[PDB]
């Protein structure tokens with residue numbers, strides 16, 4: 001029947017005033033920084049020790065939560081400019097046999113750069129911070145996410161994806177970029193879902209691909225990229241305004257706010273692409289412009305904004321709760 005269309009009608013359970021204060025008190029940026037982020041601030045292009053440590057580190061964090069996460073490693077070989085490589089997409093699902101899933105993702109790999117002044121590229125905003133931010137969300141919402149084990153409702157849950165091999169080895173191109181996402185999107189496209197169904201794939205399963213990238217610079221501006229996601233975008237603007245109005249953000253002005261009503265001139269390439277081209281509805285939370293420090297050794301911890309990321313943690317968590325009705 002018409003479960004693949006439930007997404008098109010799905011509405012949010014908008015939190016009340018005190019629930020917003022409650023969530024706000026929920027997340028801790030000090031914790032995330034130390035425990036979720038710092039370990040990831042290491043060289044971690046595919047096949048590197050970083051890659052494995054990052055992969056271990058992300059799984060370590062998730063495995064220690066109460067909510068019934070189900071980790072899966074999507075390892076595959078592909079050709080690259082540098083020769084055959086192994087890529088390992090990290091998927092993390094609650095209630096995986098549930099038909100529908102809201103999907104947050106980022107990329108955990110970093111871009112490769114040869115050593116300049118003994119400096120190593122650690123891709124802080126790009127996209128370690130999104131990583132940690134997802135991990136914080138997992139933690140900060142663990143109790144509330146737990147009640148999804150309780151099986152009344154819409155048959156919907158949360159999925160995380162930590163894509164590997166987003167970056168290009170050489171120069172960006174169809175063939176040298178999005179290795180993990182190009183691979184997992186194809187795989188999802190052709191895996192029946194739910195098990196033993198006719199016609200429908202796991203891609204019918206993705207209600208919305210929320211893709212975090214290049215977050216951590218101060219005062220980011222996000223365009224509203226896609227018509228078919230626009231209402232969910234407008235929720236983020238709605239959430240942002242509301243938290244500020246409640247003095248639950250720090251270092252925030254409505255002039256220097258985050259989600260802008262304007263759209264985007266060209267077309268940005270990222271992990272969402274092989275999904276969007278297969279008609280996954282996509283909410284692409286990449287800033288325009290990119291950070292100043294983008295793809296430069298200055299993409300480092302000295303150059304993140306504590307309050308910006310923390311603020312974005314609050315905003316994002318509310319969005320997820322509200323989507324899943326928790």
Ligand SMILES: COc1ccc(NC(=S)NCCCn2ccnc2)cc1OC
Pocket residue numbers: 126213214267268269270287288289290294
């Ligand atoms: C620096 O300003 C920009 C440069 C290029 C683009 N366009 C595209 S298609 N970017 C693809 C990004 C891939 N990626 C994601 C993370 N690390 C790499 C836009 C920019 O500013 C809006």
Ligand SMILES: [Co+2]
Pocket residue numbers: 111126167295
């Ligand atoms: Co990059």
